[PDB]
Amino acid sequence: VRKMKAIYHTLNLCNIDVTQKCLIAEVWCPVTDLDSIQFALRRGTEHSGS
Amino acid sequence: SQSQGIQQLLQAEKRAAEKVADARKRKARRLKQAKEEAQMEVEQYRREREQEFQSKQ
């Protein structure tokens, strides 16, 4: 519950687009971890059916 | 290119909006057509029943 809530907090911590049912956000992440994050994005979205 | 990806998506949204509005316009058109065709069918039905009546008489 604590985690889902935190997730929800972040989801509120977003910009809701109008043209797409997609959220776009400004996110700052370390260049060092840029590959790590791109692989993480792949894993996250890969679980999802879309 | 962020602004452009956004604009391209907005264009897709615009098309979607157009596609359903046009579908609703067609619906209205199809309904009027339905009424006119119905009446045309009624006229054919009428002719057939008129013929049956005269045959019977």
Automatic annotation (TrEMBL), chain B:
It comes from the Eukaryota. Residues 33-53 have a biased composition (Basic and acidic residues). It is found in: Endomembrane system. Subunit of the V1 complex of vacuolar(H+)-ATPase (V-ATPase), a multisubunit enzyme composed of a peripheral complex (V1) that hydrolyzes ATP and a membrane integral complex (V0) that translocates protons. V-ATPase is responsible for acidifying and maintaining the pH of intracellular compartments and in some cell types, is targeted to the plasma membrane, where it is responsible for acidifying the extracellular environment. V-ATPase is a heteromultimeric enzyme made up of two complexes: the ATP-hydrolytic V1 complex and the proton translocation V0 complex. The V1 complex consists of three catalytic AB heterodimers that form a heterohexamer, three peripheral stalks each consisting of EG heterodimers, one central rotor including subunits D and F, and the regulatory subunits C and H. The proton translocation complex V0 consists of the proton transport subunit a, a ring of proteolipid subunits c9c'', rotary subunit d, subunits e and f, and the accessory subunits ATP6AP1/Ac45 and ATP6AP2/PRR. Belongs to the V-ATPase G subunit family. This is V-type proton ATPase subunit G. The chain holds residues 3 to 59 of 118 of the full protein.
